[PDB]
């Protein structure tokens, strides 16, 4: 049966398996497609890489406002663009 090998995780996957890959300071959502050539598809469209962290859609977090001296609350939206929102709290 057909497999993919991911050199970043070091693991072997079956077609349709989904997993996380650490690459270029980000976490990618990957899927083993195979297609006769161990084809893997990886995306960061559905994650929010803010502040050096990696969040999933619906995650919320807090981060300091640069200069204001208060915190922000942020929410990961994704929208196919790795997009998030922040507001003062």
């Amino acid at each position: 049966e057909e497999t993919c090998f991911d050199k970043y995780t070091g693991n072997t996957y079956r077609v349709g398996d989904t997993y996380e890959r650490p690459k270029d300071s980000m976490i990618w959502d990957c899927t083993c497609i195979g297609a006769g050539r161990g084809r893997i598809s990886c995306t960061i469209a559905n994650r929010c890489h803010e502040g050096g962290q990696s969040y999933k859609i619906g995650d919320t977090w807090r981060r300091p406002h640069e200069t204001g001296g208060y915190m922000l609350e942020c929410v990961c939206l994704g929208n196919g663009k790795g997009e998030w929102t922040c507001k003062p709290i």
Binding site: R37, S41, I44, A45, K81
Partner: peptide, 14 residues
């Protein structure tokens, strides 16, 4: 720059 939000990889021809 982040020009695209995904990539595709497959086995090298060699």
């Amino acid at each position: 720059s982040i020009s695209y939000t995904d990539e595709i990889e497959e086995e090298d021809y060699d």
